[PDB]
């Protein structure tokens, strides 16, 4: 099965997922000087006040915080999007060291980690149908740098001990994802893909310019998770990021001048 090791990592994925070499793969490097300000881009509308988190799961690749997406509660609208996208889960990618971990890069800069808030287009009815469409998903990406602690992240950090290994989950209700945002909703946007297998080309990427700060202690706890299941040899869950992919025939557009 695919993973992030030398034997099964990003260089191998194309053998079982040939779209890995497709025309709109993610992540990409964001070249800030050539991303063009688009004054027709609308402000992002993030409506998370009614979000219903349910559970946190170590899936062997990251941890996912899952939401009740059986109704229009937490939704993303506006920005580059047409119509309404429902939040289904968030997760992170991070490094073994503070100098790497993000998937997107900014003028080749790697951040310590990257948060992905995953949403699906309600006009397709379910996430499974949305991932059969080129406009099925919208992922809001937020960079993490190491500095002061992020108070809204600490509830996540403090549950990780209970989901150390692949396949473990824990009840995780009443978590407010508004506590993970930065102040500004300035963003870059481009058409891309899932960054893990199956690498499907369904995503409108919306990457916020402003990183959130997290403390060294917070990200260190991410790095104590395990890729392996219980009873198996311990493999620290670190460096679960895909490198930047060729931009090909795409443009990145900035919401801000
Ligand atoms: C077993 O060994 C594998 C399995 C899957 C992959 S792959 N193409 O899904 O990364 C690579 C190696
Ligand atoms: C039909 C596949 C469902 C399982 C995979 O779902 C994903 C995978 C990657 C991302 S990401 N890193 O691009 O945000 C978001 C959702
Ligand atoms: Na451009
Ligand atoms: Na419901
Ligand atoms: Zn992701």
Curated annotation (Swiss-Prot):
Keywords tagged on the record: Acetylation, Cell membrane, Cytoplasm, Disease variant, Lyase, Membrane, Metal-binding, Osteopetrosis, Phosphoprotein, Zinc
Phenotypic consequence of residue 64 to L: Reduced activity
Site feature (Involved in the binding of some activators, including histamine and L-histidine) residues: 89
Location(s) in or outside the cell: Cytoplasm; Cell membrane
Record text on activity regulation: Activated by X-ray, histamine, L-adrenaline, L- and D-phenylalanine, L- and D-histidine, L-His-OMe and beta-Ala-His (carnosine).
Impact after mutating residue 196 to S: Enhanced p-nitrophenyl acetate esterase activity, but normal CO(2) hydrase activity
Outcome of mutating residue 4 to H: Reduced proton transfer rate
Chief location of this protein within or outside the cell: cytoplasm
pH dependence, record text: Optimum pH is 6-8.
Effect listed in the UniProt record for changing residue 61 to A: Reduced CO(2) hydrase activity, rescued by 4-methylimidazole (4-MI). Reduced proton transfer. Enhanced proton transfer. Enhanced proton transfer capacity
Phosphoserine PTM positions: 162, 169
Annotated positions binding Zn(2+): 91, 93, 116
Principal EC category: lyase
Impact after mutating residue 195 to S/V: Reduced activity
Cofactor(s) the record lists: Zn(2+); Co(2+)
BP GO annotations: angiotensin-activated signaling pathway; carbon dioxide transport; morphogenesis of an epithelium; neuron cellular homeostasis; positive regulation of cellular pH reduction; positive regulation of dipeptide transmembrane transport; positive regulation of synaptic transmission, GABAergic; regulation of chloride transport
Consequence of changing residue 116 to E: Strongly reduced activity
Self-association and partners: Interacts with SLC4A4. Interaction with SLC4A7 regulates SLC4A7 transporter activity. Interacts with SLC26A6 isoform 4 (via C-terminus cytoplasmic domain).
Protein name (Swiss-Prot/TrEMBL): Carbonic anhydrase 2
Lineage: Eukaryota, Metazoa, Chordata, Craniata, Vertebrata
